[PDB]
């Protein structure tokens, strides 16, 4: 073989990039890609004030060392140099401009061997314990003479540019700051053919912005308790049911990722599990699906708003549906007048007649969600009736229980009214919501009996995450977790090709949801009280590509 | 000497033991322990006809080899004195193996004996005269691992001479006639390191456990550490629960036994649960949202780390099916599950001043058979009133098996205040695929210590019942927990329970003649081969 310099001396690059203030030349239908995150700095300093989580991450990565692994690292390097043979520390290299941006109390960077690249400055110009080098090659010379774990290139742009340039980077620890700031310096555009993403972290919120961490890798080129594992799997199937009908070769990017910790993967992995292990069934006359039974997803609303990023989604419609529910409405015309067609097909003359609702007016969806939420138990008449003080106002009741009896285990909202089922345009999919309160934080579990993974679920996750935010707010609580329990989870065969494409896309840090803070009652929300900020997503996809 | 013979030459023991019958009692024991499983053979052959899974397991283990790991041992071995494994058995044992299957293929067969014509068999079939002579035969061969296949006499000698590093023990959870037994294993000398998943093979459940002698690439490895840079150092309640008390639990490497889905939740709630003085002043540790799945086709999930009785919960189930709400019916059968919820004082505090004692209101049974009807009293005739959900789900399962609307719901929002108390088991949803029925039950409130164990058994039984009257085979029972909690008063008992190793699960047998959900009677249910640890009082309050 022919050892590569970056491999022998373990040279890595670590950075943090925000989005750049681009000029809206006429289309807000912005096209997003990895290059969306490229802002490095502005006016000699970072573009942002303080994002402490990234600092913590930066410090942890650049200071972490594994002494037990060094003995191996040393041998490799000496062998490479043909020179067969104080806590261990990592080396950090940075441009002069980067060095000058660091506050005096933080330089030199603690527990790290600091190296600075410069031409205009010499060792005499520095009081600190640091190594000065005037050219990339000197670093390689220095590294061959030092005892260190790993080497991290900290920037700036010029420094990144030349290192990536000479392919002296083994991996790029890239922090994606999902917010926009003014920038004058940028990270070099990464050659998609020279570097591939191999891992994505969980998403977090720090100093009013979400962010995640991804890793780019450079293109290709007791043991007795380990056998017990092999024995215990003596009775496993070599393959997966639909493997031959799906072909893993199609999920190259998806399978090539080592660490998939981004929350969106809970959704993506379920899609994958169903495609590979789902049972073939025939739900509605003709149409076919792949199905599984029993899944659970958890989204941390305090850290992000889980709006899928591997495809484009709009929320105006589902928000109006939600306000429609809250108003206790069952009149489909209200949504149609706002150009929301979610329920249009379930309210036609033909659809109603086939549900045996011959005496139901067009678009009168019957005692569905809204009616059940505000009047469960009342006798449904028509969509124009005034059901004031009729039935059980569940909504009002759960809000009251959350405010005065937070530890109660009976805080549930249920739409599955067994008596009214046949009067509904169709039985509800979202059976119930149960709330949980701890230390001023509100969590919600929603049980879905039937789940269309390809089309519905994406919207369903958003609907209830927003609802949890709304309920938390009017009860003076902070949103915590939104827990989605899936009963019959299916993938329509018509969606397969589209989901294959989606599964090979890498998620972007999630966006955030902002609610007008003045709203103190669940019934006072209007469409303009909701704001989805920093939504970065891939190209929209039609689940079924029929034409 | 830091390590001895067994560790040096890697000598393992592999066996399969069934339970033994006694001319004293039938199939019901009083006390159970690891020695419960000790049946090795009967009249020169195995106690049982055929258990193909154990045969498959035995074969897979005795033949498996990892050549890229050999020299690691070879080095250590010599530094003391197609790669295959070595198998040692007694003559009597060798005599039982059939001709066509003898000698054991792909393995180095050795026969410990005293009177064997070493010239009557090929040289590929080694023979030793004494236990301590095997160490000599190993120092000359190229083998990966050495497996002692018995028999009883052989095991005994090897165990006494402490030449056993590990014991791959198959627990056959059924009884047979035996005349030979496995030597009682000294717990002080050996400890269970791993327990597999539970299986059913040839009409018996069994699992595999591993005994261990008490000794008393990197690229993405660092990346793993970086992604955990924000993870909490210690566990929320470490100090209060003290993980050191769970030595056995923590000492187990592989915990694949289904009972661990339950046990792990207990552990997770203890270690990470949120302290909440929820109700009555009584404290609890709570978490939100868990899911357990049990394979009813392979076993009945009746907890074995403690003793559980089922007559009570079966009668409750039949009571639900009859659509009853009369607490007295149960009390007169000494089923007191609902007694506290039906007293004058409890009803009055529920504001049910006009409700008769033990008249629980429109609860489970009423909703199951009459959802929507107007509840009057527990004695009224409700025939043809309200929606009969039970009848409907059964018809849906039979006539429209792929329906995604097969739900049985007890949470009738309109009747909640009229019930002695709102249902904990909100609903059941069914799934039918390839002649198999699965069930999901969503529980809003879960008392991990007392309730959940019974809840699991209760709905597993119900799944079997529905499946049978629909001519389907039961598949999975899926348990979804909402507010999952451990009462503080149960903590010490659960600590004890968490350190007990599960036994292979029992099986449930229903009278096969019952084909209508309403025709079941208490005598139609039987639990078989229930092996369990001694009962535990969750509330140790004397
Ligand atoms: N968010 C993030 O992850 C990062 C943000 N930044 C930001 O970007 C800005 C700095 O980036 P940038 O302007 O490109 O400056 P750099 O930090 O990259 O420094 C460039 C300078 O360093 C020296 N240098 C670089 N290469 C060599 C070489 N081969 N030989 C000798 N000397 C060399 C020279 O200094 P000299 O003049 O002495 O000759 C040169 O002018 C700051 O605003 C900073 O806050 C930077 C890195 C990461
Ligand atoms: N379920 C399971 O996992 C197992 C079941 N079994 C069952 O148990 C029965 C066999 O056990 P068992 O009756 O004890 O007979 P064994 O298989 O243990 O063989 C005993 C005989 O082997 C030779 N032998 C054993 N130890 C020594 C020694 N130290 N030195 C010299 N020779 C030795 C002697 O034969 P010789 O007469 O030539 O002197 C001795 O009489 C069978 O019915 C079999 O099916 C056995 C093992 C495992
Ligand atoms: O909010 C919703 C509403 C519907 N569906 C899907 C699930 C099923 O694919 C179909 C409804 O069919 P039934 O389960 O009612 O048969 O719509 C969702 O995923 N989310
Ligand atoms: O079948 C049952 C019935 C009750 N409980 C428990 C859960 C709660 O600890 C208590 C009911 O109290 P509330 O959740 O209603 O407050 O009983 C179970 O675990 N299983
Ligand atoms: C804490 C910011 C930060 N986060 C990440 N992920 N990478 C980096 N390279 C830096 C960084 C930028 C400039 C200097 Cl001068 C030092 C470090
Ligand atoms: C397949 C039975 C089996 N299963 C297990 N788990 N262990 C064993 N030691 C044997 C066994 C019994 C008698 C002979 Cl002669 C050979 C092997």
mmCIF file with all atom_site columns, C-alpha atoms in Angstrom, chain A residues 12 53 56-57 60-61 64 69 149-150 152 170-171 173 198-201 204 213 215 217 223-225 227-232 234-235 241 258-259 261 279-283 291-296 298 355 376-377 392 394 407 409-410 412 414 416-419 426-427 431-432 434-438 443-445 447 449-450 483 485-488 490 492, chain B residues 10 12 53 56-57 60-61 64 69 72 144-145 147 165-166 168 194-196 199 208 210 212 218-227 229-230 236 253-254 256 274-276 278-279 286-289 291 293 350 371-372 387 389 402 404-405 407 409 411-414 421-422 426-427 429-433 438-440 442 444-445 478 480-483 485 487:
data_model
loop_
_atom_site.group_PDB
_atom_site.id
_atom_site.type_symbol
_atom_site.label_atom_id
_atom_site.label_alt_id
_atom_site.label_comp_id
_atom_site.label_asym_id
_atom_site.label_entity_id
_atom_site.label_seq_id
_atom_site.pdbx_PDB_ins_code
_atom_site.Cartn_x
_atom_site.Cartn_y
_atom_site.Cartn_z
_atom_site.occupancy
_atom_site.B_iso_or_equiv
_atom_site.pdbx_formal_charge
_atom_site.auth_seq_id
_atom_site.auth_comp_id
_atom_site.auth_asym_id
_atom_site.auth_atom_id
_atom_site.pdbx_PDB_model_num
ATOM 1   C CA . UNK A 1 12  ? -8.793  16.404  10.763 1.00 0.00 ? 12  UNK A CA 1
ATOM 2   C CA . UNK A 1 53  ? -23.299 23.971  22.691 1.00 0.00 ? 53  UNK A CA 1
ATOM 3   C CA . UNK A 1 56  ? -18.687 22.594  24.282 1.00 0.00 ? 56  UNK A CA 1
ATOM 4   C CA . UNK A 1 57  ? -18.665 20.178  21.350 1.00 0.00 ? 57  UNK A CA 1
ATOM 5   C CA . UNK A 1 60  ? -14.720 18.005  23.794 1.00 0.00 ? 60  UNK A CA 1
ATOM 6   C CA . UNK A 1 61  ? -13.601 16.865  20.339 1.00 0.00 ? 61  UNK A CA 1
ATOM 7   C CA . UNK A 1 64  ? -10.315 14.195  23.805 1.00 0.00 ? 64  UNK A CA 1
ATOM 8   C CA . UNK A 1 69  ? -4.625  3.894   21.276 1.00 0.00 ? 69  UNK A CA 1
ATOM 9   C CA . UNK A 1 149 ? -3.095  11.939  19.655 1.00 0.00 ? 149 UNK A CA 1
ATOM 10  C CA . UNK A 1 150 ? -4.849  13.735  16.787 1.00 0.00 ? 150 UNK A CA 1
ATOM 11  C CA . UNK A 1 152 ? -7.294  19.344  14.235 1.00 0.00 ? 152 UNK A CA 1
ATOM 12  C CA . UNK A 1 170 ? -9.081  12.733  6.776  1.00 0.00 ? 170 UNK A CA 1
ATOM 13  C CA . UNK A 1 171 ? -12.455 13.863  8.138  1.00 0.00 ? 171 UNK A CA 1
ATOM 14  C CA . UNK A 1 173 ? -16.310 17.538  11.840 1.00 0.00 ? 173 UNK A CA 1
ATOM 15  C CA . UNK A 1 198 ? -20.856 9.194   7.229  1.00 0.00 ? 198 UNK A CA 1
ATOM 16  C CA . UNK A 1 199 ? -22.638 10.324  10.398 1.00 0.00 ? 199 UNK A CA 1
ATOM 17  C CA . UNK A 1 200 ? -25.273 12.781  11.573 1.00 0.00 ? 200 UNK A CA 1
ATOM 18  C CA . UNK A 1 201 ? -25.985 13.635  15.199 1.00 0.00 ? 201 UNK A CA 1
ATOM 19  C CA . UNK A 1 204 ? -30.238 20.453  19.497 1.00 0.00 ? 204 UNK A CA 1
ATOM 20  C CA . UNK A 1 213 ? -23.134 17.851  13.923 1.00 0.00 ? 213 UNK A CA 1
ATOM 21  C CA . UNK A 1 215 ? -18.989 14.101  9.869  1.00 0.00 ? 215 UNK A CA 1
ATOM 22  C CA . UNK A 1 217 ? -15.103 11.230  5.489  1.00 0.00 ? 217 UNK A CA 1
ATOM 23  C CA . UNK A 1 223 ? -13.352 -12.579 22.492 1.00 0.00 ? 223 UNK A CA 1
ATOM 24  C CA . UNK A 1 224 ? -14.953 -15.595 24.185 1.00 0.00 ? 224 UNK A CA 1
ATOM 25  C CA . UNK A 1 225 ? -18.002 -13.500 25.033 1.00 0.00 ? 225 UNK A CA 1
ATOM 26  C CA . UNK A 1 227 ? -18.820 -16.123 20.218 1.00 0.00 ? 227 UNK A CA 1
ATOM 27  C CA . UNK A 1 228 ? -21.727 -16.401 22.644 1.00 0.00 ? 228 UNK A CA 1
ATOM 28  C CA . UNK A 1 229 ? -23.358 -13.685 20.553 1.00 0.00 ? 229 UNK A CA 1
ATOM 29  C CA . UNK A 1 230 ? -22.961 -15.821 17.422 1.00 0.00 ? 230 UNK A CA 1
ATOM 30  C CA . UNK A 1 231 ? -24.478 -18.836 19.186 1.00 0.00 ? 231 UNK A CA 1
ATOM 31  C CA . UNK A 1 232 ? -27.511 -16.904 20.422 1.00 0.00 ? 232 UNK A CA 1
ATOM 32  C CA . UNK A 1 234 ? -28.101 -19.559 15.554 1.00 0.00 ? 234 UNK A CA 1
ATOM 33  C CA . UNK A 1 235 ? -31.798 -19.348 14.667 1.00 0.00 ? 235 UNK A CA 1
ATOM 34  C CA . UNK A 1 241 ? -38.797 -11.113 3.252  1.00 0.00 ? 241 UNK A CA 1
ATOM 35  C CA . UNK A 1 258 ? -22.375 4.841   10.273 1.00 0.00 ? 258 UNK A CA 1
ATOM 36  C CA . UNK A 1 259 ? -24.227 6.929   12.850 1.00 0.00 ? 259 UNK A CA 1
ATOM 37  C CA . UNK A 1 261 ? -28.810 9.922   15.272 1.00 0.00 ? 261 UNK A CA 1
ATOM 38  C CA . UNK A 1 279 ? -46.229 -8.094  5.298  1.00 0.00 ? 279 UNK A CA 1
ATOM 39  C CA . UNK A 1 280 ? -48.010 -7.791  1.935  1.00 0.00 ? 280 UNK A CA 1
ATOM 40  C CA . UNK A 1 281 ? -51.721 -7.025  2.317  1.00 0.00 ? 281 UNK A CA 1
ATOM 41  C CA . UNK A 1 282 ? -54.664 -5.598  0.337  1.00 0.00 ? 282 UNK A CA 1
ATOM 42  C CA . UNK A 1 283 ? -56.447 -2.939  2.420  1.00 0.00 ? 283 UNK A CA 1
ATOM 43  C CA . UNK A 1 291 ? -47.508 -3.341  6.838  1.00 0.00 ? 291 UNK A CA 1
ATOM 44  C CA . UNK A 1 292 ? -46.192 -3.832  10.359 1.00 0.00 ? 292 UNK A CA 1
ATOM 45  C CA . UNK A 1 293 ? -47.895 -3.434  13.737 1.00 0.00 ? 293 UNK A CA 1
ATOM 46  C CA . UNK A 1 294 ? -46.669 -1.377  16.682 1.00 0.00 ? 294 UNK A CA 1
ATOM 47  C CA . UNK A 1 295 ? -44.074 1.384   16.473 1.00 0.00 ? 295 UNK A CA 1
ATOM 48  C CA . UNK A 1 296 ? -43.106 4.286   18.689 1.00 0.00 ? 296 UNK A CA 1
ATOM 49  C CA . UNK A 1 298 ? -40.232 10.271  20.269 1.00 0.00 ? 298 UNK A CA 1
ATOM 50  C CA . UNK A 1 355 ? -70.803 5.439   3.721  1.00 0.00 ? 355 UNK A CA 1
ATOM 51  C CA . UNK A 1 376 ? -68.391 14.067  22.929 1.00 0.00 ? 376 UNK A CA 1
ATOM 52  C CA . UNK A 1 377 ? -71.633 12.307  23.791 1.00 0.00 ? 377 UNK A CA 1
ATOM 53  C CA . UNK A 1 392 ? -68.369 16.718  27.072 1.00 0.00 ? 392 UNK A CA 1
ATOM 54  C CA . UNK A 1 394 ? -62.814 17.290  26.540 1.00 0.00 ? 394 UNK A CA 1
ATOM 55  C CA . UNK A 1 407 ? -49.891 14.614  38.107 1.00 0.00 ? 407 UNK A CA 1
ATOM 56  C CA . UNK A 1 409 ? -52.951 10.021  34.839 1.00 0.00 ? 409 UNK A CA 1
ATOM 57  C CA . UNK A 1 410 ? -56.394 10.574  33.325 1.00 0.00 ? 410 UNK A CA 1
ATOM 58  C CA . UNK A 1 412 ? -56.715 12.105  27.741 1.00 0.00 ? 412 UNK A CA 1
ATOM 59  C CA . UNK A 1 414 ? -60.276 10.819  22.691 1.00 0.00 ? 414 UNK A CA 1
ATOM 60  C CA . UNK A 1 416 ? -62.834 7.396   18.907 1.00 0.00 ? 416 UNK A CA 1
ATOM 61  C CA . UNK A 1 417 ? -66.469 7.731   19.955 1.00 0.00 ? 417 UNK A CA 1
ATOM 62  C CA . UNK A 1 418 ? -67.716 4.185   19.343 1.00 0.00 ? 418 UNK A CA 1
ATOM 63  C CA . UNK A 1 419 ? -71.357 5.254   19.169 1.00 0.00 ? 419 UNK A CA 1
ATOM 64  C CA . UNK A 1 426 ? -64.790 8.134   8.245  1.00 0.00 ? 426 UNK A CA 1
ATOM 65  C CA . UNK A 1 427 ? -63.471 6.785   11.583 1.00 0.00 ? 427 UNK A CA 1
ATOM 66  C CA . UNK A 1 431 ? -57.561 7.807   18.430 1.00 0.00 ? 431 UNK A CA 1
ATOM 67  C CA . UNK A 1 432 ? -56.292 9.729   21.434 1.00 0.00 ? 432 UNK A CA 1
ATOM 68  C CA . UNK A 1 434 ? -52.535 11.575  26.623 1.00 0.00 ? 434 UNK A CA 1
ATOM 69  C CA . UNK A 1 435 ? -50.598 14.254  28.426 1.00 0.00 ? 435 UNK A CA 1
ATOM 70  C CA . UNK A 1 436 ? -47.859 14.071  31.021 1.00 0.00 ? 436 UNK A CA 1
ATOM 71  C CA . UNK A 1 437 ? -46.548 16.861  33.221 1.00 0.00 ? 437 UNK A CA 1
ATOM 72  C CA . UNK A 1 438 ? -43.265 16.998  35.105 1.00 0.00 ? 438 UNK A CA 1
ATOM 73  C CA . UNK A 1 443 ? -45.286 15.773  27.055 1.00 0.00 ? 443 UNK A CA 1
ATOM 74  C CA . UNK A 1 444 ? -47.910 14.223  24.779 1.00 0.00 ? 444 UNK A CA 1
ATOM 75  C CA . UNK A 1 445 ? -48.557 10.715  23.477 1.00 0.00 ? 445 UNK A CA 1
ATOM 76  C CA . UNK A 1 447 ? -51.979 6.810   19.364 1.00 0.00 ? 447 UNK A CA 1
ATOM 77  C CA . UNK A 1 449 ? -54.526 3.187   14.668 1.00 0.00 ? 449 UNK A CA 1
ATOM 78  C CA . UNK A 1 450 ? -53.790 3.508   10.960 1.00 0.00 ? 450 UNK A CA 1
ATOM 79  C CA . UNK A 1 483 ? -44.578 10.661  21.476 1.00 0.00 ? 483 UNK A CA 1
ATOM 80  C CA . UNK A 1 485 ? -47.435 5.459   18.814 1.00 0.00 ? 485 UNK A CA 1
ATOM 81  C CA . UNK A 1 486 ? -48.238 3.668   15.559 1.00 0.00 ? 486 UNK A CA 1
ATOM 82  C CA . UNK A 1 487 ? -50.738 0.840   15.344 1.00 0.00 ? 487 UNK A CA 1
ATOM 83  C CA . UNK A 1 488 ? -51.185 -0.417  11.795 1.00 0.00 ? 488 UNK A CA 1
ATOM 84  C CA . UNK A 1 490 ? -48.207 0.738   6.317  1.00 0.00 ? 490 UNK A CA 1
ATOM 85  C CA . UNK A 1 492 ? -48.599 1.864   0.037  1.00 0.00 ? 492 UNK A CA 1
ATOM 86  C CA . UNK B 2 10  ? -10.837 -23.688 26.455 1.00 0.00 ? 10  UNK B CA 1
ATOM 87  C CA . UNK B 2 12  ? -16.571 -26.068 27.717 1.00 0.00 ? 12  UNK B CA 1
ATOM 88  C CA . UNK B 2 53  ? -34.202 -26.645 18.007 1.00 0.00 ? 53  UNK B CA 1
ATOM 89  C CA . UNK B 2 56  ? -29.820 -27.375 15.783 1.00 0.00 ? 56  UNK B CA 1
ATOM 90  C CA . UNK B 2 57  ? -28.341 -25.292 18.605 1.00 0.00 ? 57  UNK B CA 1
ATOM 91  C CA . UNK B 2 60  ? -24.207 -24.887 15.568 1.00 0.00 ? 60  UNK B CA 1
ATOM 92  C CA . UNK B 2 61  ? -22.192 -24.426 18.764 1.00 0.00 ? 61  UNK B CA 1
ATOM 93  C CA . UNK B 2 64  ? -18.604 -23.182 14.916 1.00 0.00 ? 64  UNK B CA 1
ATOM 94  C CA . UNK B 2 69  ? -8.898  -16.063 16.404 1.00 0.00 ? 69  UNK B CA 1
ATOM 95  C CA . UNK B 2 72  ? -4.473  -15.989 19.707 1.00 0.00 ? 72  UNK B CA 1
ATOM 96  C CA . UNK B 2 144 ? -10.586 -24.113 18.270 1.00 0.00 ? 144 UNK B CA 1
ATOM 97  C CA . UNK B 2 145 ? -12.589 -25.123 21.352 1.00 0.00 ? 145 UNK B CA 1
ATOM 98  C CA . UNK B 2 147 ? -16.838 -29.319 24.121 1.00 0.00 ? 147 UNK B CA 1
ATOM 99  C CA . UNK B 2 165 ? -14.699 -22.850 31.783 1.00 0.00 ? 165 UNK B CA 1
ATOM 100 C CA . UNK B 2 166 ? -18.341 -22.446 30.730 1.00 0.00 ? 166 UNK B CA 1
ATOM 101 C CA . UNK B 2 168 ? -23.913 -24.081 27.604 1.00 0.00 ? 168 UNK B CA 1
ATOM 102 C CA . UNK B 2 194 ? -26.384 -14.941 29.627 1.00 0.00 ? 194 UNK B CA 1
ATOM 103 C CA . UNK B 2 195 ? -29.984 -15.983 28.939 1.00 0.00 ? 195 UNK B CA 1
ATOM 104 C CA . UNK B 2 196 ? -31.490 -16.267 25.453 1.00 0.00 ? 196 UNK B CA 1
ATOM 105 C CA . UNK B 2 199 ? -38.725 -20.687 22.100 1.00 0.00 ? 199 UNK B CA 1
ATOM 106 C CA . UNK B 2 208 ? -30.491 -21.354 26.373 1.00 0.00 ? 208 UNK B CA 1
ATOM 107 C CA . UNK B 2 210 ? -24.605 -19.736 29.740 1.00 0.00 ? 210 UNK B CA 1
ATOM 108 C CA . UNK B 2 212 ? -19.409 -18.967 33.570 1.00 0.00 ? 212 UNK B CA 1
ATOM 109 C CA . UNK B 2 218 ? -11.265 2.657   15.727 1.00 0.00 ? 218 UNK B CA 1
ATOM 110 C CA . UNK B 2 219 ? -11.955 5.563   13.377 1.00 0.00 ? 219 UNK B CA 1
ATOM 111 C CA . UNK B 2 220 ? -15.675 5.478   14.116 1.00 0.00 ? 220 UNK B CA 1
ATOM 112 C CA . UNK B 2 221 ? -15.004 4.568   17.761 1.00 0.00 ? 221 UNK B CA 1
ATOM 113 C CA . UNK B 2 222 ? -13.927 8.080   18.769 1.00 0.00 ? 222 UNK B CA 1
ATOM 114 C CA . UNK B 2 223 ? -16.745 9.484   16.640 1.00 0.00 ? 223 UNK B CA 1
ATOM 115 C CA . UNK B 2 224 ? -19.080 7.607   18.975 1.00 0.00 ? 224 UNK B CA 1
ATOM 116 C CA . UNK B 2 225 ? -17.586 9.430   21.969 1.00 0.00 ? 225 UNK B CA 1
ATOM 117 C CA . UNK B 2 226 ? -17.951 12.827  20.298 1.00 0.00 ? 226 UNK B CA 1
ATOM 118 C CA . UNK B 2 227 ? -21.664 12.307  19.634 1.00 0.00 ? 227 UNK B CA 1
ATOM 119 C CA . UNK B 2 229 ? -20.416 14.844  24.430 1.00 0.00 ? 229 UNK B CA 1
ATOM 120 C CA . UNK B 2 230 ? -23.651 16.182  25.916 1.00 0.00 ? 230 UNK B CA 1
ATOM 121 C CA . UNK B 2 236 ? -30.686 10.907  37.743 1.00 0.00 ? 236 UNK B CA 1
ATOM 122 C CA . UNK B 2 253 ? -23.994 -9.920  29.320 1.00 0.00 ? 253 UNK B CA 1
ATOM 123 C CA . UNK B 2 254 ? -26.842 -11.122 27.102 1.00 0.00 ? 254 UNK B CA 1
ATOM 124 C CA . UNK B 2 256 ? -32.547 -11.834 25.480 1.00 0.00 ? 256 UNK B CA 1
ATOM 125 C CA . UNK B 2 274 ? -39.033 11.463  37.652 1.00 0.00 ? 274 UNK B CA 1
ATOM 126 C CA . UNK B 2 275 ? -39.947 11.811  41.319 1.00 0.00 ? 275 UNK B CA 1
ATOM 127 C CA . UNK B 2 276 ? -43.650 12.608  41.630 1.00 0.00 ? 276 UNK B CA 1
ATOM 128 C CA . UNK B 2 278 ? -48.695 11.839  42.291 1.00 0.00 ? 278 UNK B CA 1
ATOM 129 C CA . UNK B 2 279 ? -51.653 10.896  44.487 1.00 0.00 ? 279 UNK B CA 1
ATOM 130 C CA . UNK B 2 286 ? -42.587 7.865   36.545 1.00 0.00 ? 286 UNK B CA 1
ATOM 131 C CA . UNK B 2 287 ? -41.675 7.791   32.859 1.00 0.00 ? 287 UNK B CA 1
ATOM 132 C CA . UNK B 2 288 ? -43.878 8.300   29.789 1.00 0.00 ? 288 UNK B CA 1
ATOM 133 C CA . UNK B 2 289 ? -44.182 5.960   26.806 1.00 0.00 ? 289 UNK B CA 1
ATOM 134 C CA . UNK B 2 291 ? -43.650 -0.562  24.361 1.00 0.00 ? 291 UNK B CA 1
ATOM 135 C CA . UNK B 2 293 ? -43.856 -7.119  22.571 1.00 0.00 ? 293 UNK B CA 1
ATOM 136 C CA . UNK B 2 350 ? -66.228 9.771   43.479 1.00 0.00 ? 350 UNK B CA 1
ATOM 137 C CA . UNK B 2 371 ? -71.196 1.288   24.439 1.00 0.00 ? 371 UNK B CA 1
ATOM 138 C CA . UNK B 2 372 ? -73.512 4.258   24.063 1.00 0.00 ? 372 UNK B CA 1
ATOM 139 C CA . UNK B 2 387 ? -72.934 -0.945  20.425 1.00 0.00 ? 387 UNK B CA 1
ATOM 140 C CA . UNK B 2 389 ? -68.002 -3.870  20.280 1.00 0.00 ? 389 UNK B CA 1
ATOM 141 C CA . UNK B 2 402 ? -57.168 -6.514  6.866  1.00 0.00 ? 402 UNK B CA 1
ATOM 142 C CA . UNK B 2 404 ? -57.501 -1.113  10.249 1.00 0.00 ? 404 UNK B CA 1
ATOM 143 C CA . UNK B 2 405 ? -60.535 -0.330  12.386 1.00 0.00 ? 405 UNK B CA 1
ATOM 144 C CA . UNK B 2 407 ? -60.621 -1.648  17.959 1.00 0.00 ? 407 UNK B CA 1
ATOM 145 C CA . UNK B 2 409 ? -62.454 0.801   23.300 1.00 0.00 ? 409 UNK B CA 1
ATOM 146 C CA . UNK B 2 411 ? -62.641 4.871   27.321 1.00 0.00 ? 411 UNK B CA 1
ATOM 147 C CA . UNK B 2 412 ? -66.187 6.183   26.794 1.00 0.00 ? 412 UNK B CA 1
ATOM 148 C CA . UNK B 2 413 ? -65.696 9.921   27.456 1.00 0.00 ? 413 UNK B CA 1
ATOM 149 C CA . UNK B 2 414 ? -69.388 10.466  28.159 1.00 0.00 ? 414 UNK B CA 1
ATOM 150 C CA . UNK B 2 421 ? -62.941 4.836   38.054 1.00 0.00 ? 421 UNK B CA 1
ATOM 151 C CA . UNK B 2 422 ? -61.827 5.516   34.461 1.00 0.00 ? 422 UNK B CA 1
ATOM 152 C CA . UNK B 2 426 ? -57.978 2.291   27.128 1.00 0.00 ? 426 UNK B CA 1
ATOM 153 C CA . UNK B 2 427 ? -58.197 0.077   24.076 1.00 0.00 ? 427 UNK B CA 1
ATOM 154 C CA . UNK B 2 429 ? -56.410 -2.989  18.427 1.00 0.00 ? 429 UNK B CA 1
ATOM 155 C CA . UNK B 2 430 ? -56.096 -6.155  16.387 1.00 0.00 ? 430 UNK B CA 1
ATOM 156 C CA . UNK B 2 431 ? -53.986 -7.026  13.376 1.00 0.00 ? 431 UNK B CA 1
ATOM 157 C CA . UNK B 2 432 ? -54.466 -10.100 11.229 1.00 0.00 ? 432 UNK B CA 1
ATOM 158 C CA . UNK B 2 433 ? -51.839 -11.424 8.838  1.00 0.00 ? 433 UNK B CA 1
ATOM 159 C CA . UNK B 2 438 ? -51.744 -9.804  16.977 1.00 0.00 ? 438 UNK B CA 1
ATOM 160 C CA . UNK B 2 439 ? -53.032 -7.389  19.603 1.00 0.00 ? 439 UNK B CA 1
ATOM 161 C CA . UNK B 2 440 ? -51.978 -3.973  20.857 1.00 0.00 ? 440 UNK B CA 1
ATOM 162 C CA . UNK B 2 442 ? -52.768 0.847   25.194 1.00 0.00 ? 442 UNK B CA 1
ATOM 163 C CA . UNK B 2 444 ? -52.904 4.974   30.272 1.00 0.00 ? 444 UNK B CA 1
ATOM 164 C CA . UNK B 2 445 ? -51.664 4.236   33.789 1.00 0.00 ? 445 UNK B CA 1
ATOM 165 C CA . UNK B 2 478 ? -48.034 -5.640  22.064 1.00 0.00 ? 478 UNK B CA 1
ATOM 166 C CA . UNK B 2 480 ? -48.025 0.185   25.076 1.00 0.00 ? 480 UNK B CA 1
ATOM 167 C CA . UNK B 2 481 ? -47.527 1.968   28.407 1.00 0.00 ? 481 UNK B CA 1
ATOM 168 C CA . UNK B 2 482 ? -48.513 5.587   28.888 1.00 0.00 ? 482 UNK B CA 1
ATOM 169 C CA . UNK B 2 483 ? -47.777 6.870   32.395 1.00 0.00 ? 483 UNK B CA 1
ATOM 170 C CA . UNK B 2 485 ? -44.656 4.235   37.265 1.00 0.00 ? 485 UNK B CA 1
ATOM 171 C CA . UNK B 2 487 ? -44.402 3.146   43.579 1.00 0.00 ? 487 UNK B CA 1
#
